[PDB]
Amino acid sequence: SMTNNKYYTEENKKKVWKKHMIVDKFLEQPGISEAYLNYLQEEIHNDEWIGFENEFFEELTGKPVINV
Amino acid sequence: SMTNNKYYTEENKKKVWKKHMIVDKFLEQPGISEAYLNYLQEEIHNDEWIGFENEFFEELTGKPVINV
Ligand SMILES: [Ca+2]
């Protein structure tokens, strides 16, 4: 969670990996998953997300979070 | 699956990085942020989260997701 390639350190990569594992469980909780869907349905049209087309597509259509 | 270092590839690191930015804005929405901190309060005790205590602490006390 930062747009700076300078902060894109493998230590921060691991930090972010683990925090995403934590929040992923929260997103699957009933109610929350629907409000998250509503958020994405709104956010996918927000042109501030330059270059995130593919990640918005994967989250909205329920594609896996990572590539196995 | 995110626990297996076999998939800790660089493509997956970047994918997680960008998806975590998307999810971070949702967690700042009013209502959701409270529900998330409640979730964290409950879940910190579960043994699934052994060795995630630093991340739970950072998320619980409003630390930046990455160091910076
Ligand atoms: Ca809806």
Author numbering:
A (entry chain A), B (entry chain C): 0 to 67
Recite the paper's sentences.
Our in silico complexes indicate that the AimX M14 residue plays an essential role in phi3T_93 and MazF recognition and substituting for a charged residue in that position should prevent AimX function. Next, we produced phi3T_93L23D by replacing a hydrophobic residue that interacts with the AimX M14 for a negatively charged one. The new charged residue had no impact on the protein integrity and quaternary organization as confirmed by solving its crystal structure and SEC analyses. BLI analysis showed no binding of phi3T_93L23D to AimX and a strong reduction (two orders of magnitude) in its affinity for MazE. Overexpression in the recipient cell of phi3T_93, but not of the phi3T_93L23D, restored the ability of the evolved phage to produce lysogens. This confirmed that phi3T_93–AimX interactions are important for the lysis–lysogeny decision. In addition, strains expressing phi3T_93, unlike those expressing phi3T_93L23D, blocked the lytic cycle and promoted lysogeny of the wt phi3T (measured by plaque and colony counts 3 h after infection). These results validate both the structural complexes and the common mechanism of recognition observed for AimX–phi3T_93 and MazE–MazF, which are driven mainly by the insertion of a hydrophobic helix into the grooves of the dimers of phi3T_93 and MazF.
